[PDB]
Amino acid sequence: LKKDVFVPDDKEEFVKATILSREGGKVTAETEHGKTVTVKEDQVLQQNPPKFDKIEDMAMLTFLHEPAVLYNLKERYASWMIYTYSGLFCVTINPYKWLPVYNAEVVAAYRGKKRSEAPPHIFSISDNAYQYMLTDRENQSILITGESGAGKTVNTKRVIQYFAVIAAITGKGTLEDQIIQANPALEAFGNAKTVRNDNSSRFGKFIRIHFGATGKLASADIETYLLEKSRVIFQLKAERDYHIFYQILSNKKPELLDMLLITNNPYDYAFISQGETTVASIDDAEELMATDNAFDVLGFTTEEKNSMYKLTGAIMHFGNMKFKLKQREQAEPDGTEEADKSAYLMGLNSADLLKGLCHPRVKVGNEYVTKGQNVQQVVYAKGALAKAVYERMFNWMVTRINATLETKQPRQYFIGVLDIAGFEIFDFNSFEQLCINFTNEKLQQFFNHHMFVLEQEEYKKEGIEWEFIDFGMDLQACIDLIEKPMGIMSILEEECMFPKATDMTFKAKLFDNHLGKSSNFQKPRNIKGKPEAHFSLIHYAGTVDYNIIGWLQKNKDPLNETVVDLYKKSSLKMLSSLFANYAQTVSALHRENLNKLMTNLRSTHPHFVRCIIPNETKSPGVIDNPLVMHQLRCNGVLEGIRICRKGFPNRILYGDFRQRYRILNPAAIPIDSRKGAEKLLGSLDIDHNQYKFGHTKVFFKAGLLGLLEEMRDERLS
Ligand SMILES: Nc1ncnc2c1ncn2[C@@H]1O[C@H](COP(=O)(O)OP(=O)(O)O)[C@@H](O)[C@H]1O
Ligand SMILES: CCc1nc(-c2ccc3c(c2)CC[C@H]3NC(=O)c2cnn(C)c2)no1
Ligand code: VO4
Ligand SMILES: [Mg+2]
């Protein structure tokens, strides 16, 4: 009835209510919690009829507003219906539990199904991108958005699983078996426990799934972006180092502990035990087996696996190396056991490593001079080297996985799946958090441009009568602040080329250029107990307080080139190969990666999947209404649905239209492909307002095409 509505609520955003009376521009209502409320007319939103309950596509709702969307999602989620269409894109809510929706019977049933003839699913997104790839002969992209913990990695792995299982119907196993095992292997080394996610991705990735001209699974490749090197040697209070360290220490493979000359205790290793060492949801012993098996399935040799294990163990001993001041400021080893162990594993000479660390060489023409190092300088250098070998080993692994994923099958098109590290806010936000949050901001803007800009531009260039709608979805100001010349990165990069520059001159340069000048740049909110911040940035998903200490060193990433030389001359083949090519700042590389990805993505047909984290307590089935609403708001879910309802989501070239639908009325076209389409459409018993004629394509309102498709099925049968 007109009695069933939604009213704004302080704690739950919106609550259901029954209108009791209407007077003086005000509505009196009882809120389905029993509260009797009086609100203004403009605040009361209509409930959709029971026939629209748990609707699969929210673009079909009679009333479209925030609580209509929120409650449709909540009701579907309560029935463990975790995917929902929102116009031409999909929304998914993290169930925080295994559901029986991803088995091989489910994958087989989705094969070739049109979006509307199957329930909302990641398999349907995957299949429909495959159908467009073969129909349009163009590359596709599956762009999975969300904050840390929302389910991007899970959905990425489900898209891969779909094509590998479909295909099933240079290593140990088949291409299908190897594509499935790539992620367990990368995750042991590139994922870690943070406060928001027990298995947080500490690298971004773009996986291309290659197909031949006829659509047969040909190959796959992975590109990874800026692994969080700092985690190797440093952890905040409620986080862990990379999974692998704890997987090895689990003692599930006693032969590994012996080979690496390590104990079973993570607290004996300084680099890996600054935060937490166990995760309730993770069995590190079983995970070690899964990692080891993944390397086998990917055709890694025993020599390649043992070298990765040895280098992981050597990083552990490297962190335990003690230094003291030389009695007379110059540092000297305070023991040699830990260096001897790490040198043995790294195929180096212990005495050479220690002398290279304390006394690095400075080139003076064709002569050299030893540079002095204090204890702080040595422990910094020792940390920088450990990060470099780890990151280089991870990059080597990705290259090695790619080599096995290369088959002798030709490639025509691909479906690329993007899985970035999601938006996050820690108590301490450093350079990593800026790089991560800037990527999320860029990916949201890619969505805004595609959905709101390119869409309305398409109507304009095709001569469709259209009034431009400003959806309030434009992040160009914040993006420009971070990436354009004289922005945050540009200033950091410039401060990098100055020897007298400090964290405070870089801070001063940021303030002098942007405080009260750039709207998205603000002064921070520092609270008692919580860490100190230097500036705050207004991102799409919230304001983030950034601490700029160490950003100049983080951006330059300097290495002791004397011990890098020793790595190059190592008797361990892998270590020498890791530093073989050793001779840009990390922000310049980040901007380059992003620019390259964004231009390459505009040459693909994108498919958006919006992952939503339901709560902060990893609780299955519980919705924190303000947290879901915030994510739907900053994602532009409502606006994205509005353009599907207000605009013309489908369009077909006249020639392709005349061909496919002549069967609906052959007497109409027994003449030009446009005249044919015009006479064909005009002769059919449809709402002639549901379509518009453009310069090259016929444009359709949501629903007209499906009806035309039903009509084509009836006639062929
Ligand atoms: N569809 C899903 N089904 C089951 N568990 C899921 C699903 N999506 C996410 N999860 C859970 O949420 C956690 C965080 O999800 P993940 O995909 O790693 O997030 P992110 O977006 O940070 O990459 C996972 O470890 C898993 O326990
Ligand atoms: C280009 C598309 C893209 N970038 C990413 C990404 C970008 C940065 C980072 C992470 C992911 C997850 C970890 C973080 N790393 C750093 O900040 C960082 C800082 N110093 N180094 C060496 C790395 N995902 O997707
Ligand atoms: O927790 V995440 O995988 O989004 O980084
Ligand atoms: Mg992830």
Residue numbers in the entry: 33 to 201, 211 to 369, 371 to 625, 645 to 731, 736 to 782
What does the paper say about this structure?
Here we present aficamten, a selective small-molecule inhibitor of cardiac myosin that diminishes ATPase activity by strongly slowing phosphate release, stabilizing a weak actin-binding state. Binding to an allosteric site on the myosin catalytic domain distinct from mavacamten, aficamten prevents the conformational changes necessary to enter the strongly actin-bound force-generating state. In doing so, aficamten reduces the number of functional myosin heads driving sarcomere shortening. The crystal structure of aficamten bound to cardiac myosin in the pre-powerstroke state provides a basis for understanding its selectivity over smooth and fast skeletal muscle.
To better define the mechanism of action of aficamten and to explain its specificity for β-MHC, we co-crystallized β-MHC with aficamten and Mg.ADP.Vanadate. The structure solved at 2.33 Å resolution revealed that two β-MHC motor domain molecules were trapped in the pre-powerstroke (PPS) state in the asymmetric unit. The electron density map unambiguously identified the position of aficamten and the nucleotide in both molecules. As suspected from competition assays, aficamten targets the same pocket as blebbistatin, located between the U50 (upper 50 kDa) and the L50 (lower 50 kDa) subdomains in close vicinity to the inorganic phosphate (Pi)-release backdoor. Little conformational change occurs upon aficamten binding, the primary difference being a new position of the Leu267 side chain. A more detailed analysis of the pocket shows that most of the interactions are hydrophobic in nature with only two electrostatic interactions. The first electrostatic bond involves the carboxyl group of the L267 main chain that forms a hydrogen bond with the N–H moiety from the amide bond between the pyrazole and indane of aficamten. The second electrostatic interaction involves a hydrogen bond network between a water molecule with the nitrogen from the imidazole of H651 and a side chain NH2 of N654 of β-MHC and nitrogen 4 of the oxadiazole from aficamten. Despite binding to the same site as the nonselective inhibitor blebbistatin, notably aficamten is selective for cardiac β-MHC relative to smooth and fast skeletal muscle myosin. Specificity is likely achieved through the above-mentioned second electrostatic interaction involving a water-mediated hydrogen bond to residues CarH651 and CarN654 of β-MHC and nitrogen 4 of the oxadiazole from aficamten. Inhibition of ATPase activity by the compounds results from prevention of rearrangements of the myosin internal cleft, which are required to change the actin interface and thus the release of the hydrolysis products.
